[PDB]
Amino acid sequence: MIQTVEFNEQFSKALDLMENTNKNVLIVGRAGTGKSTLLNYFRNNTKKKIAVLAPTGVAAVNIKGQTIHSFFNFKPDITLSSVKDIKPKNKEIYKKLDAIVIDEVSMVRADLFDCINEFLKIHGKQPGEPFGGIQLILIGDLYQLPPVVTSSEKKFFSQIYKSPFFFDSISFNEAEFEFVELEKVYRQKDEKFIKLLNAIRNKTIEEKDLEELNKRYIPDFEPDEKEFYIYLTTTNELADKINQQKLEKLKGKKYVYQGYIEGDFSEKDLPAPLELVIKKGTQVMLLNNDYQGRWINGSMGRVVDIEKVKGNEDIIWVELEDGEEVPVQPYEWDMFEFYYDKAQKKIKSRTVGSYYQYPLKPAWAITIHKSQGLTFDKVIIDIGRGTFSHGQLYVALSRCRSLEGLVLKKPISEKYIWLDKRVVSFLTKYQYK
Amino acid sequence: MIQTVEFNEQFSKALDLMENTNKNVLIVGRAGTGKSTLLNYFRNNTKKKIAVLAPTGVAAVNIKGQTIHSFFNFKPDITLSSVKDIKPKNKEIYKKLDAIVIDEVSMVRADLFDCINEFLKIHGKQPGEPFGGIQLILIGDLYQLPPVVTSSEKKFFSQIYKSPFFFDSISFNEAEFEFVELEKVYRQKDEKFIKLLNAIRNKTIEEKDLEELNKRYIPDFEPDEKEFYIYLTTTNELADKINQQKLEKLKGKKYVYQGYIEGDFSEKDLPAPLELVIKKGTQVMLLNNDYQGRWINGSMGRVVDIEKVKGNEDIIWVELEDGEEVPVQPYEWDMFEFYYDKAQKKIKSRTVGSYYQYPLKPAWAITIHKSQGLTFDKVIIDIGRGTFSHGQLYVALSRCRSLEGLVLKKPISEKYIWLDKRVVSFLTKYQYK
Ligand SMILES: Nc1ncnc2c1ncn2[C@@H]1O[C@H](COP(=O)(O)OP(=O)(O)O)[C@@H](O)[C@H]1O
Ligand SMILES: Nc1ncnc2c1ncn2[C@@H]1O[C@H](COP(=O)(O)OP(=O)(O)O)[C@@H](O)[C@H]1O
């Protein structure tokens, strides 16, 4: 229960809208703003009978949340008509809930948002009113690739929703959300990078500074066995090839570790891959924040000599960016579920599942979607390799930390870097309202 | 320099034909016989500058010998025409060789035998017609299945060779081959079963023994969990799926061990599987002979708690058929290659490859072909599934030890056990010559 979080104007304004008011609110930052920090400070220090949810199972386990389809008992094929037949597991709850938070709201499609509103409108405190009158708190990175919509759905989805963004859902317009944008980049020496990114957001590109970009299209391929460059790909398939090809053409023995599921857990979504295949000298990424304060979620390293085990489970030493030769051991992930405790006036969260695996994954290459909400010091913006579609360039650039660590494989650097101005329309509406 | 071999008439007659004479010889056993015993006693205690070969890489590593393709530089697709263009790696050798042994000759197809004869006809010591004069010693079990012949090659193979068995090759006919059959059953004592099996051999079975066979012809199932049983299948696909089905169902944690290849080896013929996926409580097969004298090749067991005490490597504790608790650790297999050294005026064997892996594999089900030369106390004979072969039943029955341990999946059985009388013809020719 600590207080070491630097309460600035935006932070204090957001907490004001959150706790003392019961208004629907939308808080955005871009990577470093304190989205998880603000959410969790509210989460720990409130008595407001709240429920914290997240779109994916990976996002839910990280925030210790409830994996929304599970919280509402939504089948993978849910629709605005089938939602009406859903019987709540925990019917007694959603009458008592005062507020509900949703993290990483960027990747919640419009149809699912409308299903949520209908569900809370029928089972909420005040039925008929938006969300049953329950205060809704949205937290996410607007500067994100919209939720994909398969080719089959495309024809009629285009006719129901203007965009797969959550903010183009009919329920979001009929309800008023106070807008708060986190602008402060904490623990960030990324000076002039965010100014460049904000310049790319607007029409202020200052193409002298655009060609100040044109300086880092080096090719000559290459990297180093030391410089920890990560490839950002558009699809799993390409990231999956770079991980394997780098894993091959590499000597030493491979070590394979199988994740263990206790209780109930889906595969996917797993934070760490189920089969951890590590050779000596393998570039890896750590997928959780260390309690002991040694590495963070996304801290890259290089697998080094494993000492083998004493009578406990074996460890994987890793050579971090700064040093560091840290012993990584398997980490326990838990899958929560919120419920009301009839005994007292409180909503408790029991754990229905456990998952055990080394918190690491091969980190020679990653996909943009997998790297949502992460910044890497040295990145490689690789080939498409089948379509570099509209507005994917601003997101990929927003994955980087500095310009002197950015290497652009293809020197494309042209006039569709622009953030995909559906978002831009939404932001210019709310910032000036 | 061991002398513990109890040199029975058959044995002394076979060694006499081997050592003092230079005649081609054909020794057959029934896998309880002294085949490996005779081969290794001759191998160790001789001064005859010989070369020991085996068809597969697995059979070669077990006998500490070389594969036929490796010794002759035979490409996987060799034909009798292309053999003439093969340049020997070690041309100088095959002038010095006095004898050549070939173990597990049962699984040597006719075309390969003719290629061997042609090669030694061209490069051998005094390279005339009979293998270039090199004395050939063949050792194998005739009671095993013939070497498979793909459907494509079948049409024209059928017209050149009457059967894919080695004795229907050409060379053999114009080859003086003394015949010795090890018929005496080396104990573990085979009392009722070998008499019944030999009765099926000579088609002299009695319907008293058919009815006494029909007694273990029962429907239903299950293995008594401890009680070790195995399902002998016709195909890898069926047997290996049963190993997976028993492995998924059973609870606990998975442990994955990767074999390490040093130098040069093969991925097709490995003694232990390359990826050992082992759960606690899993039936295993202990697939090599322990020097310390704790378990034999084929001695089945059930994995019990794996004590991962390390500062080098962890140990897999296994409960044998009698008892038990043996610590199984990785075993080193080596791939030899013979060469002639004028300095010692003899045939030395250097090791060009090494393979390290725990000598274990899941043993809920294995294929007849994999289990060549083995007897198991408790066997489950399925239907193939389906109608196994013309003559697969006799081999499957010859895999068993006793009738009070053989369990036949289904009573259909009517009479198709009969030995594959191409073998019967050959055996009645040589036994009465
Ligand atoms: N508002 C803030 N006050 C104090 N520290 C912050 C704040 N925002 C970010 N930080 C620092 O930055 C780090 C990452 O913040 P985080 O909450 O993960 O940002 P986001 O959730 O936007 O990714 C935290 O470890 C914290 O130390
Ligand atoms: N000549 C022999 N003298 C004594 N015991 C033998 C002899 N041959 C075989 N045995 C017994 O049979 C076992 C297997 O013999 P082996 O040569 O491996 O048979 P095969 O080659 O037919 O599998 C040996 O462990 C041994 O105890």
Author numbering:
A (entry chain A), B (entry chain B): 1 to 433
Lines from the paper:
Pif1 is a DNA helicase belonging to family SF1B of Superfamily 1 (SF1), which unwinds dsDNA with 5′ to 3′ directionality. Pif1 is involved in DNA repair and is necessary for the maintenance of mitochondrial and nuclear genomes integrity, in the regulation of telomerase activity and in the replication fork progression. We were able to crystallize the helicase core of Pif1 from the thermophilic bacteria Deferribacter desulfuricans and Sulfurihydrogenibium sp., which are moderate thermophilic bacteria, living at an average temperature of 65 °C. Pif1 from these bacteria are named DdPif1 and SsPif1, respectively. The helicase core of Pif1 from thermophilic bacteria is very similar to other bacterial Pif1 structures already solved.
By testing different subgroups, it was found that indexing in spacegroup P21 with unit cell a = 113.138 Å b = 129.29Å c = 113.68 Å α = 90 °C β = 103.4 °C γ = 90 °C gave an acceptable MR solution. An unambiguous solution was found in MR with four molecules in the asymmetric unit. The four molecules are arranged in two dimers related by tNCS. The nucleotide binding pocket sits between domains 1A and 2A but most of the interactions with the base involve only domain 1A and the N-terminal tail. The adenine base is stacked by an aromatic residue of motif IV (Y183, Y186 or F187 in DdPif1, SsPif1, and BsPif1, respectively) and a hydrophobic site chain of a residue of the N-terminal tail (A4, V5 or M4 in DdPif1, SsPif1, and BsPif1, respectively). Most of these residues are interacting through their peptidic bond, K28 to 735 for DdPif1 and A31 to T37 for SsPif1. Since the resolution of these structures is limited to 3.2 Å, details of interaction, in particular Mg2+ and water molecules, could not be built.
